[PDB]
């Protein structure tokens, strides 16, 4: 089972660091950005629709 905590703890310390990349409030030097997007797909923890996500 996974959702958000998994990658948040694996890649960074908490979701706080993850949100920084999304809201671009503290744009890191690409390192964290790439690491986050990479880890998200690597570990995979779709909160909804395990298959994928498209349309509505």
Curated annotation (Swiss-Prot):
<comment type="function">
    <text>Is the main repressor of the genes involved in the de novo synthesis of purine nucleotides, regulating purB, purC, purEK, purF, purHD, purL, purMN and guaBA expression. In addition, it participates in the regulation or coregulation of genes involved in de novo pyrimidine nucleotide biosynthesis, salvage and uptake (pyrC, pyrD, carAB and codBA), and of several genes encoding enzymes necessary for nucleotide and polyamine biosynthesis (prsA, glyA, gcvTHP, speA, glnB). Binds to a 16-bp palindromic sequence located within the promoter region of pur regulon genes.</text>
</comment>
<feature type="DNA-binding region">
    <location>
        <begin position="48"/>
        <end position="56"/>
    </location>
</feature>
<feature type="DNA-binding region" description="H-T-H motif">
    <location>
        <begin position="4"/>
        <end position="23"/>
    </location>
</feature>
<feature type="domain" description="HTH lacI-type">
    <location>
        <begin position="2"/>
        <end position="56"/>
    </location>
</feature>
<protein>
    <recommendedName>
        <fullName>HTH-type transcriptional repressor PurR</fullName>
    </recommendedName>
</protein>
<comment type="subunit">
    <text>Homodimer.</text>
</comment>
